[PDB]
DNA sequence: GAACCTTCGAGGAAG
DNA sequence: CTTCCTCGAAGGTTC
């Protein structure tokens, strides 16, 4: 799942978020099995 | 009503109101959202209130934000997930958005999905984010600064206009009922004529007249009291202030209509250059009382017959 | 004290004073707060003084700050958080606030609440009913959205000879100086219509009467003191007289350019245009023309020369 | 998609289209890249679409950016470094990129290399980087505002022009089939006349007329329905928009045809002076409705008779 | 390649070549660099090429930049720190350099030193830079637009002039010799006659005619084929461009031949004054199509008889 | 010392000096600080000198700073709050303070308080800082550059005038005793008449004459040495420089007294238009040698009798 | 070297040399620093050269900087902190300093102190910096841009004059000795007459003639070689250029000597209105070839005989 | 009516 | 974002 986690974190960074904050934001997600899309979507939804 | 919910209740703007009705009904006769819309016009006409009415007519929820509040692409994308299928997003002062986000904004508008690119550039991969259908409603005052690609996405254009006396008079009447005061229709017509076509000005005059009518009178705004109140304040029957009358009189009496420079006129009325050019001069041009020329300001024949002076070329 | 405390002490400004009384009485009768008031006009006419009178008549405690002190939105948010129901907030030189602060202020004026971002954190505030009062000399420099939120506009005007005569007498009693009725009128004519200038002349005459006289101002001492200061009976200064004299005797009344006139009197171009000409034009001693400026018939009669068209 | 993909599907622009065919096939016979090409003309004439057609006829992948999108040399260096042999690069409003960006383009276009200095103080060196063969495609609205030394680098100039009634009527028909709309040859002609020569306007008008016909009619676009719809949309029979009618009406009624200055006019109508002179005045000038004079704009006799006012 | 690299290859400009030969040769007996040289004249005549030739004759490296590319004094200081002994620095459009930048050159060109403030805060200090020997080459379209202190420091001046019919004919033959192509003497003469005495135009036209001869002909250029190709393009039988036809047509039809102000003409045709003053007007004057007078420009009878109008 | 320290030593300026005496004496009888004073006028007449004299007569310490040194409100807020009761603050070149800083003095001058933001972040607060009684003294050459609300707060205004020959003679004699030189009263009058009415010029002439008298003479200044030294400097008995004399001669010998334009005259003397209008023309007009008219400059009869010509 | 090192080497400027000698000798006897001095006048006459001569005669180290190299008061303060007692500070082209910095010199020049703001910002105070004795030397091409209070502080003013044929002839000879060339006295006189009285021009011509004489000649600049070399440079025997000759020719051939207006003439010569008035007309008037009049300019008899036409 | 000269007013670009 | 300044206009005299 490290690929999806890194992809989601990298994609969040590509939107201009800081590496630290993006890592924390994604680190706040619990479910590892969910796809990067659900992770980034949940991350952004939780960050709203 | 002052706060409307349907086109049946919104006062004025009959032109834009009639057009939007047809487009909304044609959209309902299909499983489609309303086309991206752009609203134009001077400030203070009700562009924001119009958005709430469109949302209620569509039977959908409204999300609201402003151009300056969007600093990075992540801000917009986060808001886009909040939109349910058919939701309306209203962006005020859309012309203030940053160029970096403009690329993302029109892309999602056209495709309803976003592609994200990551990697060093030599090796890169994409991810596809599907979005529900939605309608973007933009409001702006300055259009010449919108980019051509952005302009091309908006399929509906609406122009707001200054309210006319028959419509502006009803706003006074309805507002006069929120307070506890009776007003005669002849008095309401006199206030509307001096409101420069702007609802916010009509409310300010009504509030000032209310104070006089309940301290120097019987608490009723009759035609006799309205004339007295409008005489304590120096607002002319055309809406010219005391300073506006002094400006026109000075140009005709001392300079024979001009040309006269901005600096020369300022020192005669004892005002700053920036005050005459931005407070008083703008409205006098709209009414056609003066013109701006390479050699200075000049008074028109319309000003002579309003002030009551004979005219000669 | 120098500053009047109540409308009964406030002399002149019949237009603005009469209107504000109506609005204050109506607001009290309804137990509501007064609408936001903007005061603007020439320097020294009474804008700052009137702001304190409005507070004393309403019976509220005045909070005072100035535009140059508020440098960031955090400063204004902190100030607004201390307002209590019915309080009055007075901001002097309101034209100096940064544009980032104006956008925050004009929202609070309409809805009485704030929802703004300020390591950053969000802040939300609900404000009680309050009245904002602003004073400025450059009202055109404010943003058009902000001007639209003020509900009352007070434009100040110059005072007349009877009003300035009474002001001089009032100030003389504070200094415990004796002044005659006809002596006060001689100072009023020279004060150009401004209370601050009238008070300044009295201070300079008092010093002379104490050193070159018996400490009493009379029609005789006033002539000597005013002759030392060299202020004409029309209020023209030494340099003002030199300008008119030069135009009448060297250029036959004009037209003459600003540069030519400045070099002939040994003055800087910007000093003549911004410090001496404004009063001469408003009183009708000089007129500006497409080819220069010319002295009017009023100037010939005052200086004592035979007029020729 | 609505836009065409090949010269057979692209209607009009016969001159530009005929010239490009010869050069494109000649380049293939020699097996070399096409020379740098500049496209210019009024907005919406199809400049962007033509770039895609050229890419398909060449057999290359298009890359895209815009002048306002490039703000520093490092951007263009990265963009140009992100190029494949034979690639076609399209730059929108190439005249709007800053003067600092053109520095890279001159050596890139003529010699296909760039030079970047490195080091500080007593240390100073530079890197010279070769670029593979590529074809730049530029587009602008104004040719005279392009950089003179840059303009000299373009090898082909494609001047776009307004479409005529035969072409626009065929374009309207083409689009109508995608919407499954029934339109007669008469109604299609009315839209073509009033769309004043611009395909983008014709497509937008068609969608708006469809919404009216689906309610105020039986879904059949008749000539009578098209005329009623066009008046509801406030479109003049000459193709003058709401703003165009407002300008001419104000000059005639408030200034007797002028002369009037741009500032005064732009203050009378709630518009920016930069917008009036850039968006609206150019069309009104080409049709002779407004004339420019030493004292300002003046409405000609043609304008008086069109609006329905007796000329002096 | 196309660009010449030695004086034996550089055709024309005999007056400039004759002088530069003497000074370049004299500068080699002594062990010193060549004096600062200023080249000026119409655009596209080959002054940039001359800088490469001088560098190849001197046997040194050539660095290139432009006035518009330098924005602040620190930019120019960095460039001067990157010059090796004897290097040549070429600045194009030198007349457009900002005044804050230009005044740095007054010491560098005459004494080879610069006074600079370095550091910040308490570390701020003044340093006296000493530059190695070098030769500055400037190019400008308007020699009369340089400041008096700058122009006084250039030691050599070279005015450049339009090429004559025999010279362009050889340039066409040379260019058609680098490419594997065959051109008849009559076709080469006609193609040169169209090229406005400007080599850049001649090279661009030949390239396009070559494409046409390979697809619409037998791969050989003949007057019949050249006329067809030159007629498919907008090149008039006497070289007038479409931009030129618009100018003459607008002056004759909308101003009745004038006199008309160049400013009002420029805005009516929507063209940059600088382009018409530097690129178009000079040729129309040197060929008798446009006359001039204190009141303004005037269209001569030759223009009326060319455009097909009546010289009423 | 070279600057007078008390009213007994300060020669001339009777109007300003007479007024200041009365106001200083009256202030002492009331045991309170002097009102705010502004000194303005032409360069070199004694503005900076008078500021120190006021402090010596008041018997208090002077705190000195300048307009160019103050750049932000924190600086002025730091200079204030460091004042003691009865202190005098002197700001030279007060006309170049930033406008955002001038508005801080509006409260301090009228009511002796300042609105100060105190703390940081959530601790930020607004408090009234309060100042002791103090006297602000300002000096400037460009009084028209101050804001109207600031000038209205100064309670005393001192406008400086030019000195007369008797006063300048006494000044020269006094200075001749700061150095060690014997000077004849006849020679002192000769220098004073050539000093254009300004004390700084009178001291400058004396220094130059001293150098000559001790190198080319016996070390004493007498009518014989004064004539020789003044002949070397080439200063006419009316104070006209070499260029001043050249201007009058050219107007009388070529144009018969004028009218003549400034541009035409500048080129005839090899001077540039901006130096003549700023350095030389001012004194010639103020002393009546030249007259400006709508048609140009004209030489007056006084110039003819000075140069020795006939006023035909 | 090319630049004279001492007053014994400096030819010409007798009026300036004589005064400077007396002031320098008097300064040494008193063991004091020399008063501040300002050098001004036309370009290329020797202002920068004189600034070094003064330093060598005083026997002190010279600190050098440039007007445009100072951007803020922080720079000037750092420079003044480096001065040692008796140091000379030379500021070239002092007229380019910003006004905000120019006003800091007022205190430094008169009293050798500066007011400065120091501290972190929370704690800060004003302090005096006290400078050692020093001499400021300034050179400027146009003093009219300096403010009146600054010019009044310079104690010694030096106005440079043009050189005459006797003095300029020696400069040509001296320069030939440095180049180790041989020049005939008659040839040296020929170059001086064509140098417009300016040493920089005389040196430039000699370099070009020297290069020619050693490439196509026998290494001697005789009267015969000079004529051939000067004919190649296209410099008339009076220093007129082809443009200058074209003007005088046009005025005679098309106007019979005038009077003619500048606007009319500009069109007949294809020259820019303002360029002709500023670039070429000044020298022609000063030499008497053209004369300005109320109705226009007229070519004098001198212009006729020089061109070979028949005077009438 | 052609040419010189002075004065004013509104842009714009360099702090 | 603001101050300085430069470009264009037109009124007036004279031959
Ligand atoms: N009297 C002289 N004798 C010999 N050479 C001289 C003399 N005066 C000037 N020169 C030379 O003339 C050239 C230019 O002199 P400069 O002093 O640089 O002119 P300039 O006054 O600096 O011009 P600027 O700084 O641009 S105003 C140098 O080569 C000097 O050596
Ligand atoms: N000749 C044409 N044939 C088919 N469609 C066209 C043609 N010209 C324009 N269009 C259509 O109108 C729009 C033109 O947009 P675009 O080509 O981007 O305009 P421009 O690039 O000129 O600004 C597109 O939707 C395009 O499909
Ligand atoms: N004398 C010449 N011989 C051969 N080619 C020439 C000659 N002069 C110019 N050219 C060609 O024409 C173009 C001239 O461009 P360039 O030298 O940059 O002109 P400019 O310097 O005036 O812009 C080049 O492509 C060059 O090869
Ligand atoms: Mg106040
Ligand atoms: Mg001083
Ligand atoms: Mg020099």
Numbering used by the authors:
A (entry chain G): 156 to 203
B (entry chain D): 19 to 331
C (entry chain C): 19 to 136, 141 to 331
D (entry chain E), E (entry chain F), F (entry chain B), G (entry chain A): 19 to 330
Please quote the paper that reports this structure.
The remaining seven RuvB motors can be grouped according to the number of bound RuvAD3, with one map lacking RuvAD3 (s0−A), two maps containing one RuvAD3 (s0 and s1) and four maps showing two bound RuvAD3 domains (s2, s3, s4 and s5), together suggesting a dynamic interplay between RuvAD3 and the RuvB motors. We found that cluster [A], which is positioned at the top of the staircase, contains either ATPγS (s1 and s2), ADP + Mg2+ (s3) or ADP (s4 and s5), a configuration that is consistent with a progressing ATP hydrolysis reaction at this pocket. At the opposing lower side of the hexamer, cluster [D] contains either ADP (s1), fragmented and interrupted densities (s2 to s4) or ATPγS (s5). To understand the molecular mechanism and chemistry of coupling ATP hydrolysis and signal transduction, we followed the fate of ATPγS before (s1), during (s2) and after (s3–s5) hydrolysis in subunit A, whose nucleotide-binding pocket interfaces in trans with DNA-disengaged subunit F. During the transition through the catalytic states (s1→→s5), helices α4 and α5 from subunit F undergo a concerted motion, which enables distinct local rearrangements of trans-residues critical for ATP hydrolysis in subunit A. In particular, the intermolecular interaction between trans-Glu128 and cis-Arg21, which is maintained in state s1, is lost in the following states, enabling trans-Glu128 to instead engage with the canonical arginine finger trans-Arg171. In particular, we found that a single RuvAD3 is bound to subunit D during all five states, revealing that the RuvA–HJ complex is tethered to both opposing RuvB motors in tripartite particles throughout the entire nucleotide cycle.
In prokaryotes, the two proteins RuvA and RuvB play critical roles in the processing of the Holliday junction by promoting the ATP-dependent unidirectional strand-exchange reaction known as active branch migration. In bacteria, the Holliday junction is processed by two homo-hexameric AAA+ ATPase RuvB motors, which assemble together with the RuvA–Holliday junction complex to energize the strand-exchange reaction.
